[PDB]
Structures are given as structure tokens and as C-alpha cells.
Write a protein that binds this ligand. Sequence first.
Ligand SMILES: Nc1ncnc2c1ncn2[C@@H]1O[C@H](COP(=O)(O)O)[C@@H](O)[C@H]1O
Ligand SMILES: Nc1ncnc2c1ncn2[C@@H]1O[C@H](COP(=O)(O)O)[C@@H](O)[C@H]1O
Ligand SMILES: [Zn+2]
Ligand SMILES: [Zn+2]
Lengths: 33, 74, 297, 295
Amino acid sequence: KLVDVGLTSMDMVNLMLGVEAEFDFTEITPENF
Amino acid sequence: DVRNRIIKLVKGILEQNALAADVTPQAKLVDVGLTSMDMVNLMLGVEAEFDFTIPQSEITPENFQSVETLERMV
Amino acid sequence: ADPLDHLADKLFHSMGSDGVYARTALYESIVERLAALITSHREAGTEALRFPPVMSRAQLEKSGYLKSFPNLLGCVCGLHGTEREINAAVSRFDAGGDWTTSLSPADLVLSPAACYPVYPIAASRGPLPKGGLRFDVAADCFRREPSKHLDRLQSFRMREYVCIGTPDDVSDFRERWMVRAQAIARDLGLTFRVDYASDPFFGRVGQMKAVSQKQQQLKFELLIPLRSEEQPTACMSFNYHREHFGTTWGIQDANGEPAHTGCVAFGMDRLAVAMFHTHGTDLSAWPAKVRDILGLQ
Amino acid sequence: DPLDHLADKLFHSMGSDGVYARTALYESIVERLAALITSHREAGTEALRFPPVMSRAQLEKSGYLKSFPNLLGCVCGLHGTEREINAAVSRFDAGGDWTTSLSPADLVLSPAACYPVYPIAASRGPLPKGGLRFDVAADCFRREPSKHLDRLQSFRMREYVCIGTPDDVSDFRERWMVRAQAIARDLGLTFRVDYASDPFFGRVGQMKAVSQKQQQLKFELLIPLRSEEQPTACMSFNYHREHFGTTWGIQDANGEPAHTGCVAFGMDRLAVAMFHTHGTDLSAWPAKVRDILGL
Ligand SMILES: Nc1ncnc2c1ncn2[C@@H]1O[C@H](COP(=O)(O)O)[C@@H](O)[C@H]1O
Ligand SMILES: Nc1ncnc2c1ncn2[C@@H]1O[C@H](COP(=O)(O)O)[C@@H](O)[C@H]1O
Ligand SMILES: [Zn+2]
Ligand SMILES: [Zn+2]
């Protein structure tokens, strides 16, 4: 569980931003996170 | 002088756009049959026939009761 | 200090805007009892409708409201642009700017009086039956007149009985409501007078529209001296519209002529504030007869 | 739409989707539902009633624009000079556009009942032990035009709000989730309670919703009106953590940024749910339902 780790809304927001930045990709669902 | 005689004309003029009645200096303008649109046109038909702007403190039921009161006004 | 200001502590909480206040339980209990009292006087055959606080902008424009009180109207606006434009607007806000430059008018306004939506509704039913139609309407209304006086709000509840029919239907209706409204005010222990009145029509020309309205006696108000006998507060009105809405909405009476309309309007917040100013904010100390009328026991 | 058949007995058209006049029949059930909700109010709960507008500055400060800017209804008016206003009206008279003279007021139409309560709570100083509870209500507005009878632009919302420690709010939400279900059951309604998310605007919005769902900050009581696969949320149970506590500088009894939560009842959705389930003929409603509503 990515939420059990300790990631909240702003964390998950900055998380979707980090994935789009490290790789090159830009739908968004609970399953895949 | 003839101010009163002209005021009796612009009233019959406004009434002409609808229907006629018995216009006298003591008759209430509302009992004659003037309504809000009539009274508005008349405020302007008095300002155009005397080329002046009526003050706000003079836009009153008192001054606009009858031709007689409008006469004393202008 | 305004004579009503002392009432604020017990009746209202600040919502950060003059004329817009949160209502306490004490205050609302009295507004609800007043509403129930008015309902108890509803005539049989009167159709009850409740309107939301917004109405169609097209319907309000058609009713002629802009020609009369353009300065009082609250319009609904929203962010109707694309996702990009809306995100940019929010980003300007984040950066010290003004997001509202992205606003545009919706097709709704805040309702300035409770009865406006009732005329199109009546019109859709075809010609009026003999005797006309009676409605009981209520709405939270809005008038763009910021004030700190507790009897002059921007958002306030209005309750109205509306008559739609022949000129005789409407005059009979107004006559009976003027008698009944006064009996209600007396039962409520209120001090008041009834007088000819005019709406605050806007602009130079407006003052004359008002003169004519007074002269034609189209509007009475029940006036309660709250801060002074010389500046009393209008807590109810009794309005004759002649054929204005009938013609506007193509309403035909049983004779095939353009219907006349009129209404008796109760200002629920003004009445409530009037009660608290008159009898004080301790309900157990109110006159037993007033308490009885309102069903407080 | 399956709800459409209810329109004739419940509503009259006001010439705008999602904005309807309410019949005596309809309003009698909204009133009974309101009274039933009141009877379940917890002791020590302060009742406030809000008008359909609130301070635009307070709403901005609450962060509404970051979440649902597309839903906001703002109040605008003719704030100009007599001359400019007269000119606006003249344009309208000629069939032109008077609305270009509009500018925003300092008010918005309230998008939820609870927003005005936080600054009010803040002004009283630090919270007592056990926190504060409010009973709030408002006619709310959301700019989402629809012809579906359960998706209105103007609708009545009733909320119980808890402000306090995480525990105060947690305990409060748990009590109300049980209690809300008991109410729906006595009302003869079919439902389930499920995790949910708010309709946050934008791409980033979608993700905020995913995270909200994962943290279980929002539950909804869902009633299958038009379909069991697309049920209608008639109540929500919302945990805001310290968002409003921090925003408005509210401190709990232990000197920490207060947590907040609310239970929201959609009055119009519940009434429509009742008429859909039980029909428009009240004499035929089930006896226990008539009883608990005081019919
Ligand atoms: N700004 C206001 N604040 C409170 N009550 C109001 C306000 N404007 C009007 N009312 C009430 O609404 C009634 C009808 O309004 P009117 O259409 O102006 O006659 C009045 O008699 C008052 O009781
Ligand atoms: N557009 C709408 N039309 C009618 N009721 C609504 C609407 N949006 C929300 N509600 C009701 O208000 C409650 C609280 O709204 P929300 O804050 O979005 O959870 C919901 O659970 C619904 O019952
Ligand atoms: Zn009216
Ligand atoms: Zn809430």
C-alpha cells in the first residue's frame, strides 16, 4: 500500500509529477497506485 | 403666462397617444388617466417645451398633482 | 450606534460581509414560527410553491427588472472557459493576481423577489379560470445593497401570496390582505402604520416612476418604527402590478383580457428583527398572548 | 432517465436545468426529513443557518479554487456609475448585451454548508476539551447543469460538523456512519456505504481523488435510483484532517492545529430518493416509514 507508507495527497501529486519527470510519459486510477 | 396653456396641450398630446378626456387646471393628472409611462414622457415633454432640466427635489407628487401644480413648478 | 445593533449578539454571527449573517437558533426559531403563522392564514385553493435562491436570467430580464432596479441585481457568474483558461485563472490567484477576470455570466441570477418565477409558471397553464389563480411563494432573495443595519440585508427571506386574475380579483385580494396583514401585526404585538409607498426605481426617470406609483396607489407598506417614527421599516408590502406581468407573459384572464396581478409580501427577516426589537431577545419574557399566537406555549 | 416520471408531482420548470420550483408535496417531505435529521442531533451541538451566499474572500482562503473552480458560482453586479449603468440598460433595450458591465461582488454562492463555520469557530479562541460540534444548513450552488432530478445546481445541504482532535473527529464520523445507515434503513431506503472521492478539477484533480480514496477521507451513502451500478450519493462523511484547522488557525485543547470532519445530508437527493422508492402517494407509504417521519 503506497498510502500505508505515508504518502498523502500533495505527496501523491508530487509523485505523479516525479514519474512524468524521471521517464518521459504523461487514466490515473487507484489500482495502478 | 401662457405656460399653463402649453401644459394643457402636452397633456392632451400624451392623451392623444391613447384617448381623450376633460383636461382642467385643478384635475388630478392621475384622475385624468396618466400612468407611469405617461408621467415619464410628460416630465420630458415639459423639459423639451421649456428647454430646462427639472431638479430632483422637484420630481414630487406635490409638483405633479395637477396642471396647476406643474404650472407653479416651471 | 444604530438602535438595532444591540440585537446582533443574540441573533447573528458575522460572515465577513455587511448584510450577510449567520442565523442563531434563537433567531431561526422565531422566523420559523412567523412562517407557520403566515401559513395558518393561507386561503383555501392557494397553490404553494417554493423557489430556490436563483432563477432564470432570461425570465428576470423579460420581467423588466433591469429597467427598474439594475443596481440591485445579483447575477451568477462562473468560470465557463476551457480547462487551460481555468487553471491559468487559479494560477493568477496563487500569484497575487485577480482570477475573476476569467468570469462570465451564467444564465441565472439571484432572485430579487419571490414572485418573479411564478408568472411564467402560471402562463404555461393557459387561460386563467374564473376567479383567477392564487399562489403562496417563498424564496431566499438577494438585493445588492450592502448595509450594516440589521433591517437592511443583502440576502433575506421573502414570503408572498400572489393573485393573478381580473382587476377586480386582484383589488379584492389586496383589500382583504391589507386587513389581514394588520390583524397579524396586532396579534404579534407590533406597532405599525400602513401608508402609500413607492419602489426605489433607479435613476432620474425612476423618481418619476415612483411619483406615479404613489399617485396611482399601486403600493402600500406596513411600516414599523424600529429606529424612529420618522424612518420606519417596511416589513410587509401590498403591491398592485396592473397588467404588467399579464402582458409580459401573455396571461389571459377568463374574459380573454391581459391578466392583472398583485401580491402581498412578507419580509421574514424584517419581521423577525422587528419582533426581537419590540419584545426583546428573551422569549420567556414575551407577552403571553404573543407567545400563544406563535404557538410557543 | 428513470427519475423523470417524478417531475410532474414534485417540480415545476423554472426555465433552467437543475433549477426547479418545489411543490407542496415535495417540500412537505423535505421538511419531514429535515425534522428527522434534527431529532438525531447530538447534545452540545450549536445550530447555525447560513444564507445562500457567503464571503468570496473566506471561500478563496479555504482553498476552494484549488479544488472545484469549475463549480463555483460568483455573485456579480452592476457596480458602476449611474451613467454606465444607464448605458448597460440601454444596450439591453436594443437587444444588445448589458452583462459586459458586470463585475464581481465580494460574495459567492455557497458551494457547501460548512465553509462559513470555520472562521466563526476560529474567532472564539482555542477549542474546549472534546471540541466543538455544529449543525449547519444552507441552500448551496454548484455550476453543473443537468436534466437529471438528482443532479441540481441549487440544492439544500444539511451538515453536522466536528472540530477538535483527530480522535474527536474520528469518533464523531464513526458514530454518524452507523447512525446515518440506521436512518436510511428506517426510511425504507436501499443503500450501501462506500469509499468515495470529490470531483477535483483537472488532471492533477483526478490524482487528488485517487489519493483521497486511498486514505479513506470520504465515505458516501449510495442509493441506487437510476441503476445499481450508478447509485446516487445522498450523504457523505468527510474527514478533512487539519486543513481547515491550519487554514483558520484553530487550535484544539492540546495546542495543536484542529482536525475537522462533517456528515453531509443532501436534502433534495434524499427527498427524491424517498419519492422514487415509495411513490408520490404518501397515504400508501409503509407504516413504519410514515411513523418515523411523523406522518
Ligand atoms: N434589504 C432588505 N432586507 C430585509 N428585508 C427586505 C429587504 N428588502 C425588502 N425586504 C422585505 O421584503 C418586503 C418586500 O420587498 P419589496 O419588494 O421591496 O416591497 C419588504 O416589505 C421587506 O419586508
Ligand atoms: N449537484 C447536486 N445536486 C443535488 N444534491 C447534491 C449535489 N451535489 C451534492 N449534493 C448532495 O450534497 C451532499 C454533499 O456534497 P459533497 O460535498 O459533494 O459530498 C452529497 O452527498 C449529495 O447528497
Ligand atoms: Zn411579489
Ligand atoms: Zn462540510
